[PDB]
Short mmCIF file of C-alpha atoms and ligand atoms in Angstrom, two decimals:
data_model
loop_
_atom_site.label_atom_id
_atom_site.label_comp_id
_atom_site.label_asym_id
_atom_site.label_seq_id
_atom_site.Cartn_x
_atom_site.Cartn_y
_atom_site.Cartn_z
CA UNK A 32 20.97 -8.54 -22.50
CA UNK A 33 17.90 -10.67 -21.52
CA UNK A 34 16.66 -13.69 -23.62
CA UNK A 35 12.99 -12.74 -24.40
CA UNK A 36 13.97 -9.21 -25.65
CA UNK A 37 15.84 -10.32 -28.88
CA UNK A 38 12.96 -9.68 -31.45
CA UNK A 39 9.14 -10.37 -31.74
CA UNK A 40 8.72 -9.01 -28.14
CA UNK A 41 7.51 -5.85 -30.02
CA UNK A 42 4.68 -7.96 -31.64
CA UNK A 43 1.08 -6.84 -30.86
CA UNK A 44 -0.34 -9.24 -28.23
CA UNK A 45 3.11 -10.14 -26.82
CA UNK A 46 3.44 -9.76 -22.97
CA UNK A 47 7.04 -10.16 -21.71
CA UNK A 48 7.73 -10.23 -17.91
CA UNK A 49 11.39 -9.40 -17.08
CA UNK A 50 11.96 -10.89 -13.61
CA UNK A 51 15.32 -9.09 -13.11
CA UNK A 52 16.87 -8.82 -9.58
CA UNK A 53 17.61 -5.41 -8.01
CA UNK A 54 20.71 -3.63 -9.46
CA UNK A 55 20.62 -6.06 -12.52
CA UNK A 56 20.21 -3.11 -15.05
CA UNK A 57 16.37 -2.86 -15.66
CA UNK A 58 16.36 0.99 -15.70
CA UNK A 59 19.87 1.94 -16.99
CA UNK A 60 20.84 -1.07 -19.26
CA UNK A 61 17.82 -3.15 -20.50
CA UNK A 62 15.45 -0.15 -20.86
CA UNK A 63 17.82 1.96 -23.12
CA UNK A 64 18.37 -1.17 -25.35
CA UNK A 65 14.56 -1.78 -25.59
CA UNK A 66 14.25 1.95 -26.52
CA UNK A 67 17.09 1.81 -29.19
CA UNK A 68 15.23 -1.14 -30.87
CA UNK A 69 11.81 0.59 -30.65
CA UNK A 70 13.34 3.75 -32.30
CA UNK A 71 15.16 1.64 -34.98
CA UNK A 72 11.83 -0.23 -35.79
CA UNK A 73 9.80 3.08 -35.64
CA UNK A 74 7.33 1.68 -33.06
CA UNK A 75 5.32 4.30 -31.05
CA UNK A 76 6.54 3.45 -27.47
CA UNK A 77 5.22 4.29 -23.95
CA UNK A 78 7.74 4.06 -20.98
CA UNK A 79 6.15 4.19 -17.46
CA UNK A 80 8.30 5.22 -14.42
CA UNK A 81 6.67 4.81 -10.96
CA UNK A 82 7.94 8.13 -9.60
CA UNK A 83 9.74 11.38 -10.36
CA UNK A 84 13.05 9.95 -9.02
CA UNK A 85 12.90 6.90 -11.42
CA UNK A 86 11.76 9.31 -14.27
CA UNK A 87 14.99 11.37 -13.75
CA UNK A 88 16.94 8.00 -13.66
CA UNK A 89 15.34 7.33 -17.14
CA UNK A 90 16.31 10.86 -18.42
CA UNK A 91 20.05 10.05 -17.77
CA UNK A 92 19.75 6.43 -19.13
CA UNK A 93 17.94 7.73 -22.34
CA UNK A 94 20.20 10.80 -22.78
CA UNK A 95 21.27 11.13 -26.49
CA UNK A 96 17.98 9.57 -27.78
CA UNK A 97 14.90 11.32 -29.39
CA UNK A 98 12.51 10.68 -26.45
CA UNK A 99 9.73 12.95 -25.01
CA UNK A 100 9.52 13.29 -21.16
CA UNK A 101 6.14 14.26 -19.60
CA UNK A 102 5.46 16.07 -16.31
CA UNK A 112 9.84 14.81 -33.15
CA UNK A 113 9.94 11.83 -30.70
CA UNK A 114 7.92 8.55 -31.03
CA UNK A 115 8.91 7.46 -27.44
CA UNK A 116 6.90 8.98 -24.52
CA UNK A 117 8.25 8.65 -20.93
CA UNK A 118 5.88 9.50 -18.03
CA UNK A 119 4.86 8.30 -14.56
CA UNK A 120 2.37 5.43 -13.96
CA UNK A 121 -0.10 8.05 -12.53
CA UNK A 122 0.39 10.51 -15.46
CA UNK A 123 -0.67 7.79 -17.91
CA UNK A 124 -3.81 6.82 -15.96
CA UNK A 125 -4.78 10.43 -15.13
CA UNK A 126 -4.57 11.61 -18.81
CA UNK A 127 -6.84 8.62 -19.78
CA UNK A 128 -9.51 10.02 -17.40
CA UNK A 129 -10.10 12.55 -20.36
CA UNK A 132 -8.29 12.72 -27.04
CA UNK A 133 -6.10 9.74 -26.01
CA UNK A 134 -2.60 9.09 -27.42
CA UNK A 135 -1.92 5.48 -28.60
CA UNK A 136 1.33 3.43 -28.42
CA UNK A 137 1.87 -0.07 -29.90
CA UNK A 138 4.73 -0.83 -27.41
CA UNK A 139 4.42 -0.24 -23.62
CA UNK A 140 7.25 -0.79 -21.07
CA UNK A 141 6.36 -0.54 -17.29
CA UNK A 142 9.34 -0.19 -14.89
CA UNK A 143 8.69 -1.34 -11.25
CA UNK A 144 5.60 -3.30 -12.35
CA UNK A 145 5.15 -4.81 -8.79
CA UNK A 146 4.11 -1.40 -7.25
CA UNK A 147 0.71 -1.69 -5.44
CA UNK A 148 -0.08 2.06 -5.78
CA UNK A 149 -3.62 2.15 -7.27
CA UNK A 150 -2.51 4.19 -10.38
CA UNK A 151 0.20 1.50 -10.94
CA UNK A 152 -2.30 -1.46 -10.58
CA UNK A 153 -4.74 0.34 -12.90
CA UNK A 154 -2.02 1.15 -15.51
CA UNK A 155 -0.77 -2.46 -15.76
CA UNK A 156 -4.42 -3.74 -15.86
CA UNK A 157 -5.25 -1.40 -18.77
CA UNK A 158 -2.04 -2.29 -20.69
CA UNK A 159 -2.57 -6.08 -20.08
CA UNK A 160 -6.25 -5.75 -21.27
CA UNK A 161 -4.89 -4.01 -24.47
CA UNK A 162 -2.08 -6.57 -25.00
CA UNK A 163 -4.66 -9.41 -24.51
CA UNK A 164 -6.75 -7.64 -27.28
CA UNK A 165 -3.69 -7.45 -29.64
CA UNK A 166 -3.72 -3.60 -29.47
CA UNK A 167 -0.10 -3.47 -28.13
CA UNK A 168 3.03 -5.30 -26.92
CA UNK A 169 3.65 -5.03 -23.10
CA UNK A 170 6.96 -5.40 -21.17
CA UNK A 171 6.72 -5.55 -17.32
CA UNK A 172 10.08 -5.11 -15.50
CA UNK A 173 10.44 -5.81 -11.73
CA UNK A 174 12.53 -7.83 -9.25
CA UNK A 175 9.18 -9.28 -8.00
CA UNK A 176 6.56 -10.06 -10.66
CA UNK A 177 3.02 -10.22 -9.22
CA UNK A 178 2.45 -13.93 -8.41
CA UNK A 179 6.05 -14.65 -7.38
CA UNK A 180 6.73 -14.78 -3.61
CA UNK A 181 10.53 -14.27 -3.14
CA UNK A 182 11.80 -11.94 -0.34
CA UNK A 183 15.48 -12.83 -0.97
CA UNK A 184 16.12 -12.28 -4.72
CA UNK A 185 19.61 -12.34 -6.31
CA UNK A 186 22.01 -9.36 -5.86
CA UNK A 187 25.22 -7.99 -7.56
CA UNK A 188 27.09 -8.61 -4.24
CA UNK A 189 26.47 -10.78 -1.17
CA UNK A 190 23.93 -9.88 1.51
CA UNK A 191 24.07 -11.40 4.99
CA UNK A 192 20.42 -11.48 6.24
CA UNK A 193 19.86 -11.96 10.02
CA UNK A 194 16.59 -11.83 12.07
CA UNK A 195 17.02 -9.57 15.16
CA UNK A 196 14.52 -7.74 17.39
CA UNK A 197 14.20 -4.15 16.03
CA UNK A 198 12.92 -1.20 18.12
CA UNK A 199 9.36 -0.06 17.17
CA UNK A 200 9.89 3.40 18.75
CA UNK A 201 12.25 5.24 21.17
CA UNK A 202 14.66 2.91 23.01
CA UNK A 203 17.51 3.63 25.48
CA UNK A 204 19.68 0.54 26.12
CA UNK A 205 19.71 -3.05 24.79
CA UNK A 206 20.23 -2.53 20.99
CA UNK A 207 23.93 -1.59 20.78
CA UNK A 208 24.39 -3.46 17.44
CA UNK A 209 22.43 -0.44 15.96
CA UNK A 210 24.78 2.37 17.06
CA UNK A 211 28.12 0.42 17.20
CA UNK A 212 27.89 -0.27 13.38
CA UNK A 213 30.65 1.68 11.52
CA UNK A 214 28.92 2.04 8.07
CA UNK A 215 25.74 3.85 6.85
CA UNK A 216 22.27 2.33 7.37
CA UNK A 217 18.83 2.61 5.76
CA UNK A 218 16.11 1.83 8.33
CA UNK A 219 12.60 1.23 6.86
CA UNK A 220 9.69 2.30 9.12
CA UNK A 221 5.98 1.71 8.58
CA UNK A 222 4.87 5.40 8.96
CA UNK A 223 6.13 8.98 9.12
CA UNK A 224 5.36 9.18 12.89
CA UNK A 225 7.22 5.92 13.70
CA UNK A 226 10.07 7.35 11.52
CA UNK A 227 10.09 10.50 13.73
CA UNK A 228 10.50 8.56 17.02
CA UNK A 229 13.41 6.39 15.61
CA UNK A 230 15.15 9.54 14.23
CA UNK A 231 14.86 11.40 17.57
CA UNK A 232 16.48 8.47 19.49
CA UNK A 233 19.29 8.11 16.88
CA UNK A 234 20.16 11.84 17.13
CA UNK A 235 20.04 11.75 20.97
CA UNK A 236 22.57 8.83 20.58
CA UNK A 237 24.78 11.20 18.46
CA UNK A 238 23.97 9.77 14.99
CA UNK A 239 23.33 12.00 11.93
CA UNK A 240 19.88 11.19 10.41
CA UNK A 241 17.95 12.16 7.28
CA UNK A 242 14.25 11.19 7.26
CA UNK A 243 12.82 10.27 3.84
CA UNK A 244 9.03 10.19 3.39
CA UNK A 245 6.31 11.88 1.23
CA UNK A 246 6.74 15.19 3.21
CA UNK A 247 10.59 15.35 3.10
CA UNK A 248 11.67 13.48 -0.08
CA UNK A 249 11.88 16.24 -2.74
CA UNK A 250 13.99 18.49 -0.42
CA UNK A 251 15.99 15.78 1.55
CA UNK A 252 16.69 12.81 -0.91
CA UNK A 253 19.52 14.68 -2.76
CA UNK A 254 21.14 15.64 0.64
CA UNK A 255 21.83 11.88 1.26
CA UNK A 256 24.52 11.64 -1.50
CA UNK A 257 26.07 14.95 -0.20
CA UNK A 258 25.80 14.68 3.64
CA UNK A 259 26.29 10.86 3.95
CA UNK A 260 24.25 10.68 7.19
CA UNK A 261 24.78 7.72 9.62
CA UNK A 262 21.09 6.80 9.09
CA UNK A 263 18.41 7.30 6.50
CA UNK A 264 15.10 6.64 8.28
CA UNK A 265 12.72 6.04 5.36
CA UNK A 266 9.17 4.91 4.64
CA UNK A 267 8.41 2.71 1.64
CA UNK A 268 8.99 5.96 -0.47
CA UNK A 269 12.63 4.60 -0.82
CA UNK A 270 11.66 1.12 -2.09
CA UNK A 271 12.17 2.03 -5.85
CA UNK A 272 15.01 3.92 -7.61
CA UNK A 273 16.26 5.42 -4.32
CA UNK A 274 20.06 4.96 -4.26
CA UNK A 275 20.82 5.37 -0.52
CA UNK A 276 24.49 4.18 -0.81
CA UNK A 277 24.27 2.28 2.51
CA UNK A 278 25.90 -1.03 3.63
CA UNK A 279 23.07 -2.11 6.03
CA UNK A 280 19.25 -2.16 5.90
CA UNK A 281 17.17 -2.53 9.07
CA UNK A 282 13.67 -3.74 8.24
CA UNK A 283 10.86 -4.42 10.75
CA UNK A 284 8.84 -5.65 7.70
CA UNK A 285 5.77 -3.55 8.56
CA UNK A 286 3.74 -0.94 6.66
CA UNK A 287 0.70 1.22 7.41
CA UNK A 288 -2.56 -0.34 6.00
CA UNK A 289 -5.23 2.04 4.57
CA UNK A 290 -8.44 -0.05 4.82
CA UNK A 291 -12.14 0.74 4.20
CA UNK A 292 -13.90 -0.18 7.52
CA UNK A 293 -17.62 0.62 8.01
CA UNK A 294 -17.74 2.93 4.95
CA UNK A 295 -14.66 4.99 6.08
CA UNK A 296 -10.90 4.75 5.23
CA UNK A 297 -8.88 4.05 8.41
CA UNK A 298 -5.10 4.31 8.79
CA UNK A 299 -4.37 2.68 12.18
CA UNK A 300 -1.88 -0.08 13.15
CA UNK A 301 0.37 -1.96 10.70
CA UNK A 302 0.35 -5.07 8.48
CA UNK A 303 3.33 -7.32 7.55
CA UNK A 304 5.00 -6.21 4.26
CA UNK A 305 4.51 -8.31 1.09
CA UNK A 306 7.53 -10.33 -0.19
CA UNK A 307 7.83 -7.82 -3.12
CA UNK A 308 8.26 -5.03 -0.52
CA UNK A 309 10.78 -6.99 1.67
CA UNK A 310 12.75 -7.73 -1.54
CA UNK A 311 12.89 -4.03 -2.55
CA UNK A 312 13.85 -3.01 1.02
CA UNK A 313 16.65 -5.67 1.09
CA UNK A 314 17.57 -4.61 -2.47
CA UNK A 315 18.80 -1.25 -1.31
CA UNK A 316 21.96 -3.15 -0.42
CA UNK A 317 24.06 -5.86 -2.18
CA UNK A 318 24.17 -3.66 -5.32
CA UNK A 319 28.07 -3.85 -5.69
CA UNK A 320 29.94 -7.10 -6.75
CA UNK A 321 32.78 -7.93 -4.26
CA UNK A 322 31.05 -6.21 -1.30
CA UNK A 323 29.05 -7.94 1.41
CA UNK A 324 26.22 -5.83 2.90
CA UNK A 325 23.77 -6.64 5.74
CA UNK A 326 19.96 -6.98 5.83
CA UNK A 327 18.69 -7.05 9.46
CA UNK A 328 14.94 -7.89 9.67
CA UNK A 329 12.27 -8.97 12.17
CA UNK A 330 9.48 -11.49 11.40
CA UNK A 331 7.83 -12.80 8.21
CA UNK A 332 6.12 -11.31 5.08
CA UNK A 333 2.38 -11.56 4.16
CA UNK A 334 1.44 -11.62 0.44
CA UNK A 335 -2.29 -11.55 1.24
CA UNK A 336 -2.93 -7.78 0.77
CA UNK A 337 -6.46 -8.35 -0.70
CA UNK A 338 -8.04 -6.35 2.23
CA UNK A 339 -6.29 -3.03 1.36
CA UNK A 340 -8.27 -0.15 -0.17
CA UNK A 341 -5.61 0.04 -2.95
CA UNK A 342 -7.50 -2.70 -4.94
CA UNK A 343 -10.85 -0.78 -4.81
CA UNK A 344 -8.94 2.42 -5.74
CA UNK A 345 -7.32 0.54 -8.66
CA UNK A 346 -10.80 -0.56 -9.92
CA UNK A 347 -12.12 3.01 -9.43
CA UNK A 348 -9.33 4.23 -11.78
CA UNK A 349 -9.43 1.29 -14.27
CA UNK A 350 -13.28 1.41 -14.61
CA UNK A 351 -12.90 5.09 -15.63
CA UNK A 352 -10.09 4.74 -18.26
CA UNK A 353 -11.84 1.87 -20.22
CA UNK A 358 -13.63 -4.03 -23.13
CA UNK A 359 -13.97 -5.80 -20.71
CA UNK A 360 -10.87 -4.70 -18.66
CA UNK A 361 -9.23 -6.74 -15.81
CA UNK A 362 -6.19 -6.27 -13.51
CA UNK A 363 -2.91 -7.84 -14.69
CA UNK A 364 -3.85 -11.55 -14.74
CA UNK A 365 -2.32 -12.67 -11.39
CA UNK A 366 -3.95 -9.69 -9.52
CA UNK A 367 -7.38 -10.13 -11.20
CA UNK A 368 -8.49 -12.10 -8.08
CA UNK A 369 -8.19 -8.92 -5.95
CA UNK A 370 -10.56 -6.81 -8.06
CA UNK A 371 -13.28 -6.22 -5.43
CA UNK A 372 -16.35 -5.83 -7.77
CA UNK A 373 -17.42 -6.84 -11.34
CA UNK A 374 -15.52 -4.87 -14.03
CA UNK A 375 -17.15 -1.46 -14.75
CA UNK A 376 -18.83 -1.22 -11.27
CA UNK A 377 -17.15 2.18 -10.61
CA UNK A 378 -17.48 3.77 -14.10
CA UNK A 379 -18.81 7.38 -13.85
CA UNK A 380 -20.68 9.51 -16.42
CA UNK A 381 -18.30 11.70 -18.47
CA UNK A 382 -19.38 14.81 -16.53
CA UNK A 383 -18.82 13.09 -13.12
CA UNK A 384 -15.48 11.63 -14.40
CA UNK A 385 -14.32 15.23 -15.18
CA UNK A 386 -15.07 16.23 -11.53
CA UNK A 387 -13.30 13.01 -10.36
CA UNK A 388 -10.17 13.90 -12.43
CA UNK A 389 -10.22 17.54 -11.10
CA UNK A 390 -10.29 16.23 -7.48
CA UNK A 391 -7.38 13.79 -8.18
CA UNK A 392 -5.15 16.21 -10.14
CA UNK A 393 -6.06 19.66 -8.63
CA UNK A 394 -7.24 18.87 -5.02
CA UNK A 395 -4.77 16.03 -4.04
CA UNK A 396 -7.79 13.73 -3.21
CA UNK A 397 -7.39 9.93 -2.84
CA UNK A 398 -9.08 7.91 -5.64
CA UNK A 399 -11.51 6.62 -2.96
CA UNK A 400 -12.52 10.13 -1.74
CA UNK A 401 -12.56 11.62 -5.31
CA UNK A 402 -14.90 8.79 -6.48
CA UNK A 403 -17.39 9.09 -3.54
CA UNK A 404 -17.61 12.90 -3.99
CA UNK A 405 -17.87 12.86 -7.85
CA UNK A 406 -20.45 9.95 -7.74
CA UNK A 407 -22.74 11.60 -5.17
CA UNK A 408 -22.35 15.42 -5.15
CA UNK A 409 -24.64 17.31 -7.59
CA UNK A 410 -22.29 20.24 -8.37
CA UNK A 411 -18.50 20.87 -8.55
CA UNK A 412 -18.98 24.02 -6.36
CA UNK A 413 -20.76 22.20 -3.47
CA UNK A 414 -18.72 22.12 -0.23
CA UNK A 415 -21.60 21.24 2.23
CA UNK A 416 -20.56 17.52 2.08
CA UNK A 417 -17.46 18.58 4.13
CA UNK A 418 -19.65 19.52 7.18
CA UNK A 419 -22.95 17.53 6.72
CA UNK A 420 -21.48 14.11 7.50
CA UNK A 421 -22.37 12.01 10.55
CA UNK A 422 -21.09 13.36 13.91
CA UNK A 423 -18.56 10.47 14.29
CA UNK A 424 -16.85 11.68 11.02
CA UNK A 425 -15.77 15.02 12.67
CA UNK A 426 -12.01 15.71 12.29
CA UNK A 427 -9.98 16.69 15.40
CA UNK A 428 -6.89 18.94 15.68
CA UNK A 429 -3.87 17.56 17.63
CA UNK A 430 -5.13 19.71 20.59
CA UNK A 431 -8.40 17.60 20.76
CA UNK A 432 -10.83 20.33 19.51
CA UNK A 433 -12.81 19.57 16.31
CA UNK A 434 -11.47 21.49 13.25
CA UNK A 435 -13.55 24.58 12.37
CA UNK A 436 -13.48 26.86 9.29
CA UNK A 437 -15.62 29.56 7.59
CA UNK A 438 -17.62 29.29 4.37
CA UNK A 439 -17.51 32.38 2.10
CA UNK A 440 -20.77 33.72 3.80
CA UNK A 441 -18.93 33.72 7.20
CA UNK A 442 -20.88 30.63 8.60
CA UNK A 443 -18.65 28.75 11.12
CA UNK A 444 -18.40 25.07 10.04
CA UNK A 445 -17.09 21.95 11.80
CA UNK A 446 -15.02 19.65 9.47
CA UNK A 447 -17.32 16.60 9.45
CA UNK A 448 -17.18 15.10 5.96
CA UNK A 449 -19.86 12.69 4.57
CA UNK A 450 -16.96 10.51 3.26
CA UNK A 451 -14.11 10.20 5.78
CA UNK A 452 -10.63 9.17 4.47
CA UNK A 453 -7.96 9.33 7.29
CA UNK A 454 -5.26 9.75 4.59
CA UNK A 455 -6.54 13.30 4.01
CA UNK A 456 -5.70 14.34 7.63
CA UNK A 457 -2.30 12.72 8.40
CA UNK A 458 0.68 10.75 7.01
CA UNK A 459 1.77 13.15 4.31
CA UNK A 460 -1.37 15.34 4.08
CA UNK A 461 -2.31 18.34 6.31
CA UNK A 462 -5.77 19.32 7.65
CA UNK A 463 -4.87 22.92 6.52
CA UNK A 464 -4.84 21.87 2.81
CA UNK A 465 -8.24 20.05 3.15
CA UNK A 466 -9.66 23.22 4.85
CA UNK A 467 -8.54 25.29 1.79
CA UNK A 468 -10.84 22.97 -0.24
CA UNK A 469 -13.68 22.82 2.33
CA UNK A 470 -13.76 26.65 2.82
CA UNK A 471 -14.23 27.02 -1.01
CA UNK A 472 -10.78 28.63 -1.49
CA UNK A 473 -10.09 25.21 -3.15
N1 ANP B 1 26.60 0.57 -9.01
C1 ANP B 1 25.52 0.13 -9.65
N2 ANP B 1 25.02 -1.09 -9.33
C2 ANP B 1 23.91 -1.51 -9.95
N3 ANP B 1 23.16 -0.89 -10.86
C3 ANP B 1 23.68 0.32 -11.14
C4 ANP B 1 24.81 0.89 -10.60
N4 ANP B 1 25.02 2.14 -11.15
C5 ANP B 1 24.02 2.32 -11.98
N5 ANP B 1 23.19 1.23 -12.03
C6 ANP B 1 21.95 1.07 -12.76
O1 ANP B 1 20.94 1.09 -11.78
C7 ANP B 1 19.86 0.21 -12.15
C8 ANP B 1 19.55 -0.73 -11.02
O2 ANP B 1 19.23 -2.00 -11.59
P1 ANP B 1 17.70 -2.36 -11.67
O3 ANP B 1 17.56 -3.70 -12.24
O4 ANP B 1 17.01 -1.25 -12.33
O5 ANP B 1 17.27 -2.49 -10.13
P2 ANP B 1 15.82 -2.68 -9.42
O6 ANP B 1 15.39 -3.99 -8.83
O7 ANP B 1 14.98 -2.14 -10.55
N6 ANP B 1 16.02 -1.81 -8.04
P3 ANP B 1 15.33 -0.41 -8.13
O8 ANP B 1 15.67 0.02 -9.48
O9 ANP B 1 15.83 0.63 -7.25
O10 ANP B 1 13.90 -0.67 -7.94
C9 ANP B 1 20.30 -0.47 -13.45
O11 ANP B 1 19.59 0.12 -14.52
C10 ANP B 1 21.82 -0.26 -13.46
O12 ANP B 1 22.41 -0.20 -14.74
MN1 MN B 2 15.62 0.36 -11.43
NA1 NA B 3 17.45 16.62 8.61
#
């Protein structure tokens, strides 16, 4: 097993960090043994999966055990977000908490591990954090079940014609990480015009396309960071430009332009898609260096927004506490405004940032006028260059011109049409 998970790890106030490399058995070997002990010792246990794919991983791994899975049992399994979102309202309590993929910089994930750390530090519970890359540790080349040959090469950032034959002359299957859906689209189009089979994985295509990968065995999986955790792509090569999109609050608005360098935790997950089989050598082809300074991203403000509203006094998981942008509690809402906040998160697909600004500032849950009364520069444009228009229930023609402008609502995985359903009062 692992050394620190013999006994006493289940003791209130005990925080155990399992730095375990990719493919080392966190989800399917360690976790079911932690759960067998928890059930034996009759300890109320929370298990947090980052995503639906890892949650189904856990269902197989915990098959034949009395466990309760959340979209008799004393073990509850649910997503990082599910945990945080239910605490935005008669709270359930657990004396043991296990967080799988505890490096994830999704704001729900940062908020969940901050809450659980704050509890463990108060002797309310025992916490286990499992990840290849514990927050604090900078290691882009962790250990692997088999060998990986890593080589720096120039990687195309978009369509290309000649000069990159090493890409198409490769005889195995590849996972190519791209910083955005749109960049993913341009790479896929070139690969198919070169006669390669491609499946694109991202927030729009995952639920329908991920299970085709096993079955169709495409030449290429062109994937965003959606495939960094619990995606089994069964490839022999990763291509990794080591970039990601960077949602950033700039002049009171959330922008989504350009890229940043990935963190080491991200590079390590991307590389970790390969080298999962002893006695096989796989390839990791990358371009450039990593950047662990992600303190500028809106994710940290979004994490405080969530943590401030599920909580004394709470901090982020110790090593991340430096990236909390304001003093603890800054973002706490009244109970009534928190209800509205939760509704916008869970029912309207809002970002934490947008949901907080609306719930904090808008008198009533029925108001939609904030969607057209913003400053002129906040107007939202269709691909054809015209400003989006819609009709309020009284037939008034509106221009989509929100007071609080979050680019994430209008591209990269979200559609203007779904925001208009909200803005038009069809919600
Ligand atoms: N062929 C395999 N190689 C490695 N692990 C495997 C394999 N088949 C099933 N598994 C399980 O898959 C899981 C992968 O190991 P794990 O430590 O969870 O990786 P990781 O760093 O967490 N990478 P990821 O899980 O995708 O984020 C373990 O729980 C293994 O028991
Ligand atoms: Mn895993
Ligand atoms: Na396809």
